Amino acid sequence: GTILIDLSPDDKEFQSVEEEMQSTVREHRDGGHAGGIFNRYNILKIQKVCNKKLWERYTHRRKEVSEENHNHANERMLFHGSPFVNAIIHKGFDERHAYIGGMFGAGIYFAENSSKSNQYVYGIGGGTGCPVHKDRSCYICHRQLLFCRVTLGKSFLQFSAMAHSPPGHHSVTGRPSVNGLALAEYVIYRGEQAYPEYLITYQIMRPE
Ligand SMILES: CN1CCCc2c1cc(-c1ccccc1)[nH]c2=O
Ligand SMILES: [Zn+2]
């Protein structure tokens, strides 16, 4: 039941999603190994993901979390990079989309920095890079990220450099504690706590 609606670049909604994408690029401590070398993207397409069943699954869980946390869902818009972007937009997030080896346990991970999620589009640590050229820094091949609506509820704060959430919490927040420029990362342990709202198709751009 998923349909994808193209947004026009003239649409304010396209422009505000593009701006979140571009403005949350940072330098990474791997010098570009996982995700490539770039300071900005070429946005090719932004599509709204529309699925009634998946949306109702999300809002049902959101109300549950809200009612356990003084009517506060603590909802954020966050990036997600994954080889499984096509299954996610059709079937929703579930345990097969979890990062088993993640630093906060086996859950589904999200980033405030778009460039952090970009490191995962071709697999963990960038995998072997694009399927066509085997280049983690490919400037030709089209890449896709999700910009997702995520319910955090009561989030466990981890200071730092499928499982269950810590007792009494709905998520984990990974607060950057060494790299002063990094934004936060988040983990949920239930697929129903995220909805994949936008599909963004892009290229990374070679710096000039
Ligand atoms: C570990 N983090 C940091 C926050 C961003 C992020 C991940 C992991 C993944 C990931 C996705 C699928 C399979 C394994 C890891 N995707 C992401 O976008
Ligand atoms: Zn390529």
Return the H-helix or E-strand segment holding 65: helix 52-67
Do residues 160 and 103 lie in contact, with contact meaning Cβ atoms separated by under 8 Å?
yes
Radius of gyration of the chain (CA): 17
Do residues 83 and 123 lie in contact, with contact meaning Cβ atoms separated by under 8 Å?
yes
Q: For residue 57, how many C-alpha atoms fall within 13 Å in the half-sphere facing its CB?
A: 16
Class of 1-208 per CATH?
alpha beta
How many CB atoms are located within 10 Å of the residue 182 CB?
Answer: 21
Residue found under tokens 């900005």: 40
Give yes or no for residue 99 CB within 6 A of ligand 1: yes
* Domain segments of the chain as ranges: 1-208
Do residues 207 and 137 lie in contact, with contact meaning Cβ atoms separated by under 8 Å?
no
Give yes or no for residue 124 CB within 6 A of ligand 1: yes
Question: What does the block give as tokens for 172?
Answer: 């984990």
**Ligand 1: nearest atom to the Cα of 103:** 1
Residues 6+ apart with CB under 8 A from 83: 121, 122, 123, 127
**Data resolution in angstroms:** 2.0
